[PDB]
């Protein structure tokens, strides 16, 4: 599970 | 589980 | 579990 | 468990 | 458990 | 499992 | 498991 | 497990 | 396990 | 386990 907010 | 907010 | 806020 | 706030 | 606030 | 990004 | 980023 | 970043 | 970063 | 960073 990989979550990135950029 | 990887969470990054940038 | 890895959490980074930048 | 790794938490970093920068 | 590693917590860093910078 | 609940995930929300806003 | 609950994850929210805002 | 509850995670919130705001 | 509860984690909140604000 | 409770963790809060503010």
Q: Count the Cβ atoms, other than its own, within 10 Å of residue G6.
A: 11
Q: Count the Cβ atoms, other than its own, within 10 Å of residue D5.
A: 17
CA–CA separation, C5 and J1 (whole Å) = 20
Question: How many cross-chain Cβ pairs, A to F, lie less than 8 Å apart?
Answer: 3
The answer to whether H4 touches G4, Cβ cutoff 8 Å, is: yes
CA–CA separation, I5 and H5 (whole Å) = 5
Nearest residue in I to D5, CA atom: I5
DSSP, res C3: E
CA–CA separation, F4 and J6 (whole Å) = 21
Min Cα distance A2 → chain F (Å) is 11
Give the D-side interface with C, CB within 8 Å.
Answer: 1-6
Q: By C-alpha distance, which of F5, E4, J2, F2 is closest to B4?
A: F5
This structure's resolution (Å) is: 1.7
Within chain E, how many helices (H) and strands (E) appear? 0, 1
The answer to whether H3 touches G3, Cβ cutoff 8 Å, is: yes
Terminal-to-terminal C-alpha distance of chain I: 17
Tokens, residue C6: 């930048």
What is the experimental method?
X-ray
């Amino acid at each position: 599970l990989y979550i990135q907010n950029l």
